[PDB]
C-alpha cells in the first residue's frame, strides 16, 4: 500500500487517488491544500512518463525541469511539447 511500481518516486495509491508535491516530496492530497495554491495531480502508476514526453511524472509535478516550460505542463497529463511554425510579415514579388 506504499509501493512504487514504476519507480518515479510517487507511490501507486497516490497516483491513483491524487497527490501534490510539498518540499520536493509527493504527499497525499487533502482538499484543504487548494485555496493555498496547490494543484491535484493524478498519473499512470505503471508509466514513469504518463504523457509520453521526455520528463517523468515526478519531474513534471515537482516542476524540477527547465524553468521555461509553461506551468500547465507540470501536470502529468499535459505534455510538455512545442508547436513551432513560420508566419509571414511582408510579401515581396519581383520580375527579376
Amino acid at each position: 500500500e506504499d509501493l512504487d511500481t514504476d519507480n518515479d518516486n510517487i507511490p501507486d495509491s497516490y497516483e491513483r487517488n491524487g497527490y501534490t508535491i510539498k518540499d520536493l516530496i509527493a504527499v497525499k492530497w487533502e482538499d484543504s491544500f487548494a485555496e493555498q495554491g496547490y494543484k491535484k495531480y493524478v498519473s499512470n502508476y505503471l508509466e514513469s512518463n504518463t504523457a509520453g514526453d521526455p520528463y517523468t511524472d515526478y519531474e513534471k509535478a515537482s516542476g524540477s525541469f527547465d524553468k521555461a516550460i509553461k506551468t500547465e505542463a507540470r501536470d502529468p497529463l499535459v505534455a510538455a511539447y512545442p508547436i513551432v511554425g513560420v508566419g509571414m510579415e511582408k510579401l515581396i514579388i519581383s520580375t527579376n
Binding site: 505503471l46 504518463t50 504523457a51 497529463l77 499535459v78 505534455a79
Partner: protein, 206 residues
Amino acid sequence: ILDTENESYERRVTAKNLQDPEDKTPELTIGEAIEKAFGATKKDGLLYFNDIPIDESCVELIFDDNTANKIKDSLKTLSDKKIYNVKLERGMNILIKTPTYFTNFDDYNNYPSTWSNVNTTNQDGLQGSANKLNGETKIKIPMSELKPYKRYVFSGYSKDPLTSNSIIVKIKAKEEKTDYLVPEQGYTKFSYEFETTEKDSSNIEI
C-alpha cells in the same frame, strides 16, 4: 487548440485507451482536459481562462468530422447533454474559438457599444440573467472595431417559455438580411452569419 484572439495555444492531453485493461491512465472529460491544459480557473464551475469566459455556451467549439461523431454518439447516453461531459479520447481534435465580443448579461461585457434595452434582474439564461422587453434591441458597431474583409458569425441563446410569438433578427453589415427565429420553451442557439467589407464601411447594426 484555444484561439483567444491576440494569442493562440495548442495542447496535447493524454487520453486513456479503453480496450487495454492494463492502461491505467487517469480518465478525463473534455472540460477537465481543457481546465488542465490551459490552466483555466472555474468561477461557478464555468472555466474562465484569464477572465475570458470559456464554456460550450460562451465560446464555439469546432471539431473535425471524426470527433463530432464520437461526441454525438456519447451525447445520447449522457443525462447532462453538456459537450464538456464527454470523455477525452485518442486522436480527438477540438478547437475553441473565443468570440471577439461577448455578453452573458451577468458579469462580462466586452462590446465597445451598448445594446438598447436590456432588462436584466432576471434568473434565466442557462446562468445568471437574460434579456426581456419586446422593444427592439440594436447595437451600433463603428466598423473601426472590426476587421475589413472578414466573415463573422453572431450567436446567442433564446428561450420562449410559453411557445409564443417569433423573434425577427435583421443584420446590416454587407447584405442587409432578415430571418425569423422561433424560440422554444427550452434554450437553443441560432448562430446567424454575416460579413463585413469595404475597409471602413458605413456601420454594423444587429
